[PDB]
């Protein structure tokens, strides 16, 4: 089953981007739908063999084959439909691998799209959109960098010494100066998840324009 | 009683500013305390006769008289204390008028200090800090301006026609095109007060760095 290998992608609140690759284009549209165009070259020009349109929740997949014959020319935007409609769990295996391409893209975009920026007395924290276990960067004013992933934890020092850690396994053992930074960065993390939760809940009820991205505080 | 004429001022979250006037300096410090320096000129130079330091909540007033004799020279910052301490309700009448000077300043600063900026599909709304009945500007993307005070309501049109209204007394009667804008601006207002309320409540519990100013959304 497809659900056993990935979760449906979520493109809500992500800025539009049309990213070209050698055999394909993957796109986050204005509608927040995620589009993947399959691209083949013939006669020294590039065409579009099939299109996978995914809804903003990755539940609905629309698929069409534009026809020349046999295809449509590459453009600044995706071809108009002229069609098969699936739900995530009824998507046939031949398309899974492609969906994972779009899925894997969104996931990466999400991990770089700030969701909550928060300014403390010592640092500008940034909770990213790749929930759950979203990336979390703490850019201290004094120059120190910290970055948290679901797995590992990278630290940089003013000096620029760059290094990384496992799941807090190595946590206790560190320069207690560093102990000071990580505590404060974890304080920020608790704060940001709380803010995420309440704002999310109010957004759930409100139903109009998004409450993220969000910058909070100053200095 | 002083409380019968004004409320204690609140300087929380307001950016520092040292504003000179002809007979005085009024200042919002880094500590968020609000300082008023009384200034007199002698011998072609300016001095400082007395200083009124007010806590960030306007409850505590510290008052001193720096001595030359008879005074201290004007500076880039307020004179250091060398003193009388009052609480708002025990402040003697001779100082009320001065406190109202600082009070009236803060109030004006508050009315221009954004608290929540919120981006909709049609406009960037801005709830200001002068609570309650805080000023509320709606800057539509298409050019239209709207501004709400506790009393009156100013509208500008793309054309730049500038005009104002009483307490919605005149509300119903307007170009229904204008009816469209005001409804959406009032939608934003409901949203911003709700966000203010929940974020405020979480801030009340959290107790660390401020949750305002705050920018919310995009486009």
């Amino acid at each position: 089953t497809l659900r056993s290998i990935t979760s449906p992608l979520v493109a809500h609140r992500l800025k539009p981007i049309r990213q070209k690759t050698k055999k394909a284009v993957v796109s986050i549209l204005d509608s927040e739908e995620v589009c993947v165009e399959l691209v083949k070259e013939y006669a020294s020009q590039e065409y579009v063999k099939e299109v996978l349109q995914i809804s903003s929740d990755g539940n609905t997949i629309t698929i069409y084959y534009p026809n020349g014959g046999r295809g449509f020319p590459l453009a600044d935007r995706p071809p108009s439909p002229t069609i098969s409609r699936y739900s995530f769990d009824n998507l046939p295996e031949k398309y899974w691998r492609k969906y994972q391409y779009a899925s894997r893209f969104v996931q990466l975009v999400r991990s770089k799209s700030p969701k909550i920026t928060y300014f403390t007395r010592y640092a500008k924290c940034i909770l990213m959109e790749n929930s759950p276990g979203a990336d979390f960067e703490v850019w201290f004013y004094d120059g120190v960098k910290i970055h948290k992933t679901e797995d590992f934890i990278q630290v940089i020092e003013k000096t620029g010494k760059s290094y990384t850690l496992k799941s807090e396994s190595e946590v206790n053992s560190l320069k207690e100066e560093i102990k000071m930074y990580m505590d404060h960065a974890n304080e920020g993390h608790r704060i940001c998840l709380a803010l995420e939760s309440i704002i999310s809940e109010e957004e759930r009820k409100t139903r109009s324009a998004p409450f993220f991205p969000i910058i909070i505080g100053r200095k | 009683t002083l409380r019968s004429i004004t409320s204690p001022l609140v300087a929380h979250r307001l950016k520092p500013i040292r504003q000179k006037t002809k007979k005085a300096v009024v200042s919002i410090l880094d500590s968020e305390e609000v300082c008023v320096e009384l200034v007199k000129e002698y011998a072609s130079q300016e001095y400082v006769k007395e200083v009124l330091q007010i806590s960030s909540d306007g409850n505590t007033i510290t008052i001193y008289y720096p001595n030359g004799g008879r005074g201290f020279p004007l500076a880039d910052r307020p004179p250091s204390p060398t003193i009388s301490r009052y609480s708002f309700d025990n402040l003697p009448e001779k100082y009320w008028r001065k406190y109202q000077y600082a009070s009236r300043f803060v109030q004006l600063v508050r009315s221009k200090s954004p608290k929540i900026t919120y981006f909709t599909r049609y406009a960037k709304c801005i709830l200001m800090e002068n609570s309650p009945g805080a000023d509320f500007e709606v800057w539509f993307y298409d050019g239209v301006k709207i501004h709400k005070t506790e009393d009156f309501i100013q509208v500008i049109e793309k054309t730049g026609k500038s005009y104002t209204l009483k307490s919605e007394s005149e509300v119903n009667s307007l170009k229904e095109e204008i009816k469209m804008y005001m409804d959406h601006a009032n939608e934003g207002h409901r949203i911003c007060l709700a966000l203010e309320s929940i974020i405020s409540e979480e801030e009340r519990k959290t107790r660390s760095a401020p949750f305002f100013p705050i920018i919310i959304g995009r486009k």
Binding site: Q19, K20, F105, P114 | -
Partner: peptide, 29 residues
């Protein structure tokens, strides 16, 4: 239809986009 699972997408076109997203918090700087 040779497969796309290969495709590498994170290029400098993207880095810029990523740049853009962080630009907004770049306000007190």
């Amino acid at each position: 239809d040779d497969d796309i699972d290969d495709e590498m997408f994170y290029d400098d076109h993207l880095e810029a986009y990523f740049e853009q997203l962080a630009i907004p918090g770049m306000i007190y700087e």
